[PDB]
Write a protein that holds these residues in place. Structure first.
Motif, PDB file in Angstrom:
ATOM      1  N   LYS A  26       0.827  -1.201   0.000  1.00  0.00           N
ATOM      2  CA  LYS A  26       0.000   0.000   0.000  1.00  0.00           C
ATOM      3  C   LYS A  26       0.866   1.256   0.000  1.00  0.00           C
ATOM      4  N   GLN A  27       2.179   1.065   0.066  1.00  0.00           N
ATOM      5  CA  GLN A  27       3.114   2.183   0.072  1.00  0.00           C
ATOM      6  C   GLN A  27       4.270   1.933  -0.890  1.00  0.00           C
ATOM      7  N   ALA A  28       4.639   0.665  -1.047  1.00  0.00           N
ATOM      8  CA  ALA A  28       5.728   0.291  -1.940  1.00  0.00           C
ATOM      9  C   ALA A  28       5.620   1.019  -3.275  1.00  0.00           C
ATOM     10  N   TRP A  29       4.391   1.217  -3.737  1.00  0.00           N
ATOM     11  CA  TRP A  29       4.151   1.901  -5.002  1.00  0.00           C
ATOM     12  C   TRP A  29       3.830   3.373  -4.773  1.00  0.00           C
ATOM     13  N   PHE A  30       3.294   3.682  -3.597  1.00  0.00           N
ATOM     14  CA  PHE A  30       2.940   5.054  -3.254  1.00  0.00           C
ATOM     15  C   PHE A  30       3.832   5.582  -2.134  1.00  0.00           C
ATOM     16  N   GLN A  68       8.316  10.313   3.553  1.00  0.00           N
ATOM     17  CA  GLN A  68       9.460   9.580   3.025  1.00  0.00           C
ATOM     18  C   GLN A  68      10.525   9.385   4.099  1.00  0.00           C
ATOM     19  N   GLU A  69      11.493   8.519   3.816  1.00  0.00           N
ATOM     20  CA  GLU A  69      12.571   8.243   4.759  1.00  0.00           C
ATOM     21  C   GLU A  69      13.699   9.259   4.609  1.00  0.00           C
TER      22      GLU A  69
END
Length: 25
Positions: A8-12, A18-19
Motif C-alpha cells: 500500500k506504500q511500496a508503489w505510493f 518519506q525516509e
C-alpha cells in the motif's frame, strides 16, 4: 487474510512521509 501494508506504500511514496534524517538549519 492477506494484508498489503508494504504494498500500500511500496508503489505510493510521498516526500512528506518519506525516509529522511532530520537536518538542522
Amino acid at each position: 487474510a492477506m494484508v498489503s501494508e508494504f504494498l500500500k506504500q511500496a508503489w505510493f511514496i510521498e516526500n512528506e512521509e518519506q525516509e529522511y534524517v532530520q537536518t538542522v538549519k
